[PDB]
């Protein structure tokens, strides 16, 4: 069995208050506390980041809604926060009890997930770089739980944001989604005592980390044998008919009086009308879905342009996702770059997250896409 | 002439033990069933029958586990010693062998009885059951052939012989037949004739930096897959074993073992299932194999 | 490590072709550990995570 320290809900009502008299003299936050109770953990499922499922074990303690689940490995993580800067943290799970049963069995979530809660961002802030979103969305002052502080590797948020669509409010959820995406990195929340021996106090925060600083590509095969999980995701979101009845509105009439256009969308990515369509059907898809759009006339009285029918009937994202064993002869930890090899295929992502489960230890792959 | 049963804690392996369950101290005794049972997915529609796949699958095997010892303490250490010696290792390989075979089975401790139901001098007849992993493989050495040139005939063989500068005559099915090739001694084949699900190859390399492994080919002269190494320096050898309950990819230097796992190259080992055709040794001077092929009923 | 001689503790020891293991994709830092209770054999390497001097 694993190790499991429970605490009582981390109420940032409570512990963001700076009163604490450290031993020097200064006053900061307050410190976590000790577990209520020391307890086992015990038919498991346990999630590393929390990426696809929730994490579920029964605990020997009688745990409740609201309290904090520290699950203790005898290992270390060593996290590159500066170029040459490694620090000793030592391995941690750390869940929220969301819903205990009759038999006590807990579902826990990642605490990170479980964070950044009910928090929407408007789009203003999404402009900026990624640094200034995980600003945001880390703050103790906001969030339904209590942070101390954010380890984070500047390489890898370095990059631009990506662009919202129609520049709207979404969820903090979605958008960490949608940067994790891009990043190729997923969120580990860890409890560990202050670096400077001065202060006592026992801390909670995320990683943001990797154990190389400039993260490299790996090469690997995924065998049948590791009881490999195999379906598909998508990234980005882009409409699925890709054939298109397009309707446009007479001016004298007041209506749909005219006759419809179709236009289809080509194996490489361009939309044409169907009329001016003079091939051999090679560089047209496999299957034709349809859908039947109604346009209205702009002000001007010209018909809608054609880009603006082709953001509707273009592809979406088409991503593979592999869930399999452990190898011990080649071990894949999360938050690595890989390009996996599965039945003569060639997949390239990231290990997004890690199962540690009594009878297995398994990881999720996801194939981040841009191939061509 | 009578059958033999061999438990083995690891075939194939240095560090391997057997205990004969046939004439040694602790002994099997009537198999619960040695055949097999078949699903063949069959649905009649209007009493004309339409067959499906069948999924063979294999039941498992209950013995009448038996010990004969002097004393009390002599069983009792009897039973502690064999049931944590199949405990010690994840997989046991029970053999199975016969006047015309010796075949094997890959087999996992499913349940094993204690009881204080003793005759004489404290002997054990209890029920040890087994979980079926694989029923009935042949474990046989693979070597590869030679090929020697034919024998030269005057005026059967392409030569100008005789009379001077030499004639070679054109007759009707006799005429001239070439004696060989100019070093006959490159030609090799590793043939493999039957479909062969997993091997333990001792691969001897020649050339330091230089991919060295093996690969194979089908039929028509295509590869399927290829299991190969750049290492930096020359291994003595490289000890690869297929199987996969226990894989094994390591490169042998002196008295040291180094995997060789994260050296090979992943594009070119596309199947473990070796096919009809042949084997080809990727930059290696002696090769030893041992391949193992299931029969599913023996 | 073919031939390499080290003075840890002003304890004096030769490497020679001792192989440790390393762990893929990560800054394995080699430790030289002694134990003076283990009588048979003091020094031991490791390839660790972190530098845990
Ligand atoms: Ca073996």
């Known amino acids: 069995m694993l190790e499991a320290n429970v605490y009582d809900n981390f109420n940032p009502n409570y512990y963001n208050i700076s009163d604490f008299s450290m031993p020097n003299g200064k006053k900061e ?23 696809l499922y929730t994490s579920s074990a029964t605990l020997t303690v009688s745990v409740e809604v609201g309290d904090i689940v520290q699950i203790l490995f005898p290992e270390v993580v060593p996290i590159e926060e500066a170029l040459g800067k490694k620090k000793k943290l030592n391995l941690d799970m750390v869940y929220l009890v969301t819903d205990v049963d009759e038999s006590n069995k807990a579902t826990l979530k990642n605490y990170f997930w479980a964070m950044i809660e009910s928090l929407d961002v408007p789009n203003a802030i ?15 002052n906001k969030n339904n739980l ?17 662009i919202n669509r129609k520049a709207e409010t979404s969820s903090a959820h979605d958008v960490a989604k949608r940067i994790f995406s891009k990043v190729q990195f997923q969120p580990t929340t860890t409890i560990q005592h202050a670096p400077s021996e001065t202060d006592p106090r026992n801390l909670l925060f995320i990683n943001f980390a990797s154990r190389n600083w400039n993260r490299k590509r790996i090469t690997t095969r995924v065998d049948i044998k590791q009881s490999v999980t195999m379906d598909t995701e998508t990234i980005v979101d882009r409409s699925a008919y890709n054939f298109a009845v397009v309707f446009v509105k007479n001016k004298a009439t007041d209506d749909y009086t005219d006759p419809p256009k179709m236009y289809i969308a080509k194996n490489n990515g361009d939309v044409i009308d169907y ?49 399999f064993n452990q190898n011990e002869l080649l071990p894949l930890y999360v938050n690595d770059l890989v390009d ?33 | 002439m009578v059958r033999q049963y061999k438990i083995h804690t690891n075939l194939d392996g240095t560090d391997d033990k057997v205990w004969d369950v046939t004439n040694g101290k602790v002994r099997f005794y009537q198999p619960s069933n040695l055949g097999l049972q078949s699903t063949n997915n069959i649905w009649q529609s209007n009493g004309i029958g339409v067959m499906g796949t069948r999924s063979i699958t294999q039941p498992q095997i209950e013995f009448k586990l038996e010990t004969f010892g002097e004393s009390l303490e002599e069983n009792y250490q009897l039973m502690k010693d064999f049931v944590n010696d ?3 290792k994840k997989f046991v390989t029970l053999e199975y062998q016969t006047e015309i075979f010796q075949v094997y089975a890959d087999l996992a401790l499913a349940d094993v009885t204690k009881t204080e139901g003793y005759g004489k001098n404290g002997t054990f007849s209890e029920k040890i059951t087994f979980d079926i992993i694989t029923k009935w493989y042949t474990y046989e050495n693979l070597t590869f052939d030679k090929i020697q040139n034919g024998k030269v005939i005057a005026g059967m063989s392409k030569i100008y012989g ?18 060989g090739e100019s070093d006959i001694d490159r030609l090799s084949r590793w043939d493999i004739k039957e479909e062969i699900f997993s091997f333990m190859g001792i691969l001897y390399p020649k050339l330091p930096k230089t991919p060295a492994g093996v690969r194979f080919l089908d039929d028509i002269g295509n590869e399927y897959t290829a299991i190969v190494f750049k290492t930096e320096q020359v291994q003595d050898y490289i000890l690869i074993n297929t199987d996969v309950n226990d894989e094994t990819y390591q490169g042998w230097k002196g008295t040291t073992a180094l995997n060789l796992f994260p050296v090979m190259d992943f594009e070119r080992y596309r199947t473990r299932i070796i096919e009809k055709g042949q084997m080809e040794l990727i930059n290696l001077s002696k090769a030893e194999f041992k391949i193992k092929r299931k029969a599913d009923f023996v | 490590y073919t031939n390499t ?49």
């Open chain 3, 5 to 53: 001689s080290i003075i840890a503790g002003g304890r004096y020891f030769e490497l020679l072709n001792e192989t440790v293991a390393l762990k893929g994709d990560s800054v394995n830092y080699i430790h030289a550990n002694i134990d003076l209770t283990q009588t048979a054999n003091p020094v031991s390497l490791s390839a660790e995570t972190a530098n845990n001097s």
């Open chain 1, 126 to 140: 999404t402009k900026t770089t990624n640094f200034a979103i995980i600003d945001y969305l880390i703050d103790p």
């Open chain 1, 29 to 51: 936050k307050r410190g976590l506390p000790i577990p209520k109770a020391r307890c086992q953990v015990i038919n498991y499922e346990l999630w590393e980041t929390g990426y």
């Open chain 1, 146 to 162: 209590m942070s101390y502080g954010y380890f984070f590797n500047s390489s890898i948020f370095a990059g631009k944001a990506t």
């Open chain 2, 162 to 179: 005789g009379t001077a500068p030499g004639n070679y005559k054109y007759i009707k099915g006799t005429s001239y037949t070439y004696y």
């Open chain 1, 275 to 323: 009329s001016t369509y003079h091939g051999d059907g090679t560089d047209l898809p496999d299957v034709r879905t349809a859908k039947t759009l109604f346009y209205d006339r702009d002000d001007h009285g010209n018909p809608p342009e054609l880009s603006t029918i082709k953001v509707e009937i273009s592809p979406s994202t088409i991503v593979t996702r592999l869930i």
């Open chain 1, 340 to 372: 996996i090899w599965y039945e003569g295929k060639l997949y390239s992502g990231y290990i997004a997250d890690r199962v540690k489960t009594e009878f297995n230890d398994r990881l999720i792959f996801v194939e981040s896409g841009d191939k061509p």
């Open chain 2, 86 to 88: 199949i405990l010690s």
